[PDB]
Design a protein around this nucleic acid. Structure first.
Length: 64
DNA sequence: GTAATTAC
DNA sequence: GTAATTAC
């Protein structure tokens, strides 16, 4: 699994792959939802080249 | 503006 | 309804 580093609203974030819920491709970017504790869902996206192999396996296994 | 999808 | 993400 590992982790994913991204930027969201002027803030640089890092998130555990195990906390990622939904993954999808939009053009050439990979967008996703993740669990940020409590009942809250977060959002994020990275460039294809920056996506860990584990995030890419979740995508292909999902693609929804 | 557009893409896919979401949180709020 | 809208703003948020990368790359044209």
């Amino acid at each position: 699994m590992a982790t994913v580093k991204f930027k969201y609203k002027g803030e640089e974030k890092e998130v555990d792959i195990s906390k990622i819920k939904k993954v999808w491709r939009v053009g050439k970017m990979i967008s996703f939802t993740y669990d940020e504790g409590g009942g809250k869902t977060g959002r994020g996206a990275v460039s294809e080249k920056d996506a860990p192999k584990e995030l890419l396996q979740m995508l292909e296994k999902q693609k929804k």
